[PDB]
Design a protein around this ligand. Structure first.
Ligand SMILES: N[C@@](CCCC[B-](O)(O)O)(C(=O)O)C(F)F
Ligand SMILES: N[C@@](CCCC[B-](O)(O)O)(C(=O)O)C(F)F
Ligand SMILES: N[C@@](CCCC[B-](O)(O)O)(C(=O)O)C(F)F
Ligand SMILES: [Mn+2]
Ligand SMILES: [Mn+2]
Ligand SMILES: [Mn+2]
Ligand SMILES: [Mn+2]
Ligand SMILES: [Mn+2]
Ligand SMILES: [Mn+2]
Lengths: 314, 314, 314
């Protein structure tokens, strides 16, 4: 398989700036070379240059709407180009608002994609249900057709056309869902496995049911949007909205190892890594190292091991 | 549902005094208000005033028997009143000897209750099998009918009538059981899931089997006596008798989330929280925060999220 | 059952010397007495005296080959004697290269043994596939009949006769396997449960399948070679080659508790404990304490508890 890296050093979907350092620290960790060690022809499309939008006052309670909207608009273009190039897109975040542009761009070339969303949160607040006003907790509401008519015309987002159905997304890892978001989940009949389901079934059954749900009818490309706070803070502490009782390192690698095995991975997001929020140098390396490992598993690095198609014993 | 809080700042069931601070720190953590945020009409019956009994020399090897006996005697009265008031009793410990009074009082109003006991220990030593002499490791022996005739007349406990059958209790979390206690388990045929069973089956199957065991024949009220050392010390370090390899935070919330879903929770104990034993301020907050979370789950706080019966989208 | 302890303070199978302190720290922890507390008649055959071999230059890339070879040669003799004495052999490592001698010696008396290998690594590099040259990452290649013809004549190892079949070994815990090793796994059809399989199935199913695989056809002695780095570094940090995402303390006790229950445990290795590598005094005690607990479980210490065949209630 071939890979296209896109850096997205953007943070205006939330208050803390350091998340725009995600792509820098992920590359410093040797991600490109490590990808190249696997079954990968890898091209770096570099970091997106997100021009400042100094005039961007809140839309109602919604913060930095033009900056967020433009960044996702730009991102969508790059993703779509990467996809036209026949490559799997790898977006390095950056805050999670960017999924608006990443999924959009992906869906331009592969309208039939299904989404697996790994996260402690549902990120499905509308501009009218959000309490925080932070757009990184709203991206999914912008993408789902079933919610069009519930998203106001927000400055910066006129270009958005919700092209994804509520029935084509699965959540894994949920453990902090706003009441408005829970209402939306139940109302639209969205498939999810909160931490309660993971505890009940085991990550094994979870992935079986997730892949069966998305791929049962027919094969179709997979978009994995991975928020690092989906994993427990003991593995990814350097992130903006940590929530205890998260997925383990092991469960994280399991999810992605199983997704690799489908051979349908088409787009990937690695989001919300914020080195500024590491309490110590070790917390930063711990968070980045975990992020890197999740990424490699998506592209074939397996715990049981890997080998080239040759005779190693001769 | 309606709730009745009872503080039980008592420690004479064991050597370390700080456990009598349990109710203070649990309330300081905002427990009442957080309960009120859920489907709860909550009333605080305050903290029990446990008068000193200066003259309380050991009965054989058994320590502080009159103090322990009186405290449980008082507790039983309060629990029974809370129960007559139609409310779920919430006892904030306090050492685990208090379960003698809590379960007793509960059973006065609901003779048909079943008990789920979450703990690293079985707390089923008799006054004659105990090695420590600490009564917090003996409460279950005082309650089981099948053991009457094996409990001597201990000062302070004349009021006790064992009204619970060995067949109506399930242990979850066991990993440090005295040889005498193990004999009693096997001999009375008590249902248990030690950590070995949890590892084997998964907490999912565990709760399925636990609830089937207690509720199969017919619905009946549930009493949950939760010792915080049931959870691994990495989540509840500030407790008197920590034992490694415990239940996870996740497993803890799972147990209680499933118990909530039955709609049969009738009495709850949150025991052995001792802030004095926290190695650092963070260990204390970690322990208290975990205790609070377990409590909220018992009353409906779910990881997948919660919402009121209204249209959130309008 | 009866037990024979053998100390193997040897480290030349790898670069770090402190692993030769394994037997000292394991005994200081009270292992002998604790074994004696269980169903054990225990004899200490002491620590093997491994004479220096000052002249031991690398064979090709393979390091300290004569020292490693002699130590395993000596170890095999002691194990075989312990086995002739009708006792379960308990080898305290020491680096993992010693499994060459331990398994060999065991197999002299019990040719029909099956091996369970708990480890983050497969330790199945040949002298010609190894990258490190460290012999502790090669012991299994010396033992398997199917690989004879692929192991060159290495100084110090002329005494080795591979008497174990690839079909009679199961790995549990794998998460860092060299490409050459992965080739060997797939090629010889070796049964393994890497961490991916553990995540998928649960340690319960894992042990069921492991024991069924080795014991289905007929009963036969079990040799457990336990590398402490099989467990996550959060439980055994003081070890030479830690790898994240390991087996839990709980999973560790589960494996060994199930192995005890078969009544077929015949040989045991407790390897790669290196107190020098503990970052703090607590890391050393944590590592040693975990090592001790795994050991006791192998000999009957159960989490649900233990009791003698007597009436404890009278
Ligand atoms: N619901 C949140 C989510 C915040 C986290 C967004 B992330 O992308 O998942 O990291 C919100 O602001 O709307 C909040 F309240 F928790
Ligand atoms: N068995 C104990 C139990 C002590 C712990 C009691 B707790 O309420 O579960 O916390 C005893 O003293 O009898 C002891 F030896 F471990
Ligand atoms: N494959 C290793 C294994 C090293 C570890 C050996 B141990 O006994 O399992 O601890 C090697 O050197 O060959 C290495 F590269 F990781
Ligand atoms: Mn999140
Ligand atoms: Mn998110
Ligand atoms: Mn306890
Ligand atoms: Mn207890
Ligand atoms: Mn190893
Ligand atoms: Mn090894």
């Amino acid at each position: 398989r071939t890979i296209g890296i896109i850096g997205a050093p953007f943070s205006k979907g939330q208050p803390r700036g350091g998340v725009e350092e995600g792509p820098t620290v992920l590359r410093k960790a040797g991600l490109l070379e490590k990808l190249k060690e696997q079954e990968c022809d890898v091209k770096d499309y570099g970091d997106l240059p997100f021009a400042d939008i100094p005039n961007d006052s809140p839309f109602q309670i919604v913060k930095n709407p033009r900056s967020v909207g433009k960044a996702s608009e730009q991102l969508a273009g790059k993703v779509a180009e990467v996809k036209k190039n026949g490559r799997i897109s790898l977006v390095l975040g950056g805050d999670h608002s960017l999924a608006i542009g990443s999924i959009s761009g992906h869906a331009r070339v592969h309208p039939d994609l299904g989404v697996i969303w790994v996260d402690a949160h549902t990120d499905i607040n509308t501009p009218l249900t959000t309490t925080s006003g932070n757009l990184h907790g709203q991206p999914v509401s912008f993408l789902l057709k079933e919610l069009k008519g519930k998203i106001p015309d927000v400055p910066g987002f006129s270009w958005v056309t919700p092209c994804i159905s509520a029935k084509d997304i699965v959540y894994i890892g949920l453990r902090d869902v706003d009441p408005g978001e829970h209402y939306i989940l139940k109302t639209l009949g969205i498939k999810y496995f909160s931490m309660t389901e993971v505890d009940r079934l085991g990550i094994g059954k979870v992935m079986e049911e997730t892949l069966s749900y998305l791929l049962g009818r027919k094969k179709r490309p997979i978009h994995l949007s991975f928020d690092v706070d989906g994993l427990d803070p003991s593995f990814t502490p350097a992130t903006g909205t940590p929530v205890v009782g998260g997925l383990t390192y092991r469960e994280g690698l399991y999810i992605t190892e199983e997704i690799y095995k489908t051979g349908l991975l088409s787009g990937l997001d690695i989001m919300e890594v914020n080195p500024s929020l590491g309490k110590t140098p070790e917390e930063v390396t711990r968070t980045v190292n975990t992020a890197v490992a999740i990424t490699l598993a998506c592209f074939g690095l397996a715990r049981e091991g890997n080998h080239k198609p040759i005779d190693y014993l001769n």
